[PDB]
Amino acid sequence: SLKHSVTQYLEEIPQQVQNRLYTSPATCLAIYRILPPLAKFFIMAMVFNENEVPLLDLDKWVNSNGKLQFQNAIKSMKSLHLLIPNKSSGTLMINLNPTFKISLRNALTGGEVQNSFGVVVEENVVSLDLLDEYSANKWETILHFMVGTPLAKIPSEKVLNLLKHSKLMEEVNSTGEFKITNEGFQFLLQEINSQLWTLLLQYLKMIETMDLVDVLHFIFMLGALEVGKAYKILSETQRIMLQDMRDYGLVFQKHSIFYPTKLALMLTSDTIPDGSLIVETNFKIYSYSNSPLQIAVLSLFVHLKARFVNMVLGQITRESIRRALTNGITADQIIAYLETHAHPQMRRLAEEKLEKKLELDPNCKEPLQVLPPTVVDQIRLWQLELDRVITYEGSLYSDFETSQEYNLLSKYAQDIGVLLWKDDKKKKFFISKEGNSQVLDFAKR
């Protein structure tokens, strides 16, 4: 999703801002890697040629089969203003952005880069001992607060405010606490790379007047830096934002010099299993997860009963699923988490059942199911219980002198999509509270 979500954010950026962004070669290289593979082919060809190339020739470059990919590639390039079209003498010529072209060329070859990539100090630090531990602790702490489980350490105020403003992990002052919404659980399910960009993108939106271009340049530059190998401390806005990243764990400072963190390398791009669990027809759960986070996240919708060093065992109960649904989690997410973390034994047994079913009747094909059907059905049914009775807020209109007026009002309410119930025999109809003002205004006129 990063290959698309990050692209969408860049497209929304104004053209003038995008042109400024292309100044730094490091950002250009990152923006080069996010484009579709076919876009990479065309862009690289145009980097080393300082001349206009007609669009027809680029079309000829592609085969008949891959016409659809070409259409997507050109649209993506045009969206980001990478390709500037020019119409003259009845010819449609396309050229690369001079700022992007020069910066990208400088990155590939040896040339002035205005120290965009930073400067090496030749002071390496063991990663498996300190940087990795520091990165895990910071990510472990922030995630623990998100899940809601108690933890003595508290995330910094700046990150706490961002989460409060952020849609995920909604906080209610009246309740006096912070709770996980549907988006919050989705964030937990998403991998580390998706989670990191999820927070980073929100921070970029929140920041107003720290220049946006400066922040984006540092973030893209951060990916270029490799684990360890501190670099000398760069705009003033970058320095303060660097401190913010340090609170997030993306960067480690000894107090002078900042060591890039492993998460920074993961930020560049992608790259029995831990966290897997077994679900029985008896509704028991046994998770082979020793990580403290895995136990906490499971406890959100599972009634934990005991734990060993090797694994944690619990059971799904009406209380556990009811609690999760009340928080805001959907039953679809609950099954998704259980299935993705299925134990290999469950997968092997499910495959055997599928093979036997196919042998009995290969004509009919059904999807492979890892979890037992009964457990999934019970969880879905429990969700249906919450929506057993539906309540709407609105007003009821009746006692109409003429049937024509009632019909016109009912038709108008339905058109604007605010009619909840109607009955011609009684000449009554109930509308939603949101549309009450609109209906009243229409009645007056």
Binding site: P373, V376, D377, R380, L381, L384
Partner: peptide, 9 residues
């Protein structure tokens, strides 16, 4: 698994 289908009757 039949859940969303109309109840028998």
């Amino acid at each position: 698994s039949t859940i969303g289908k109309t109840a028998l009757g």
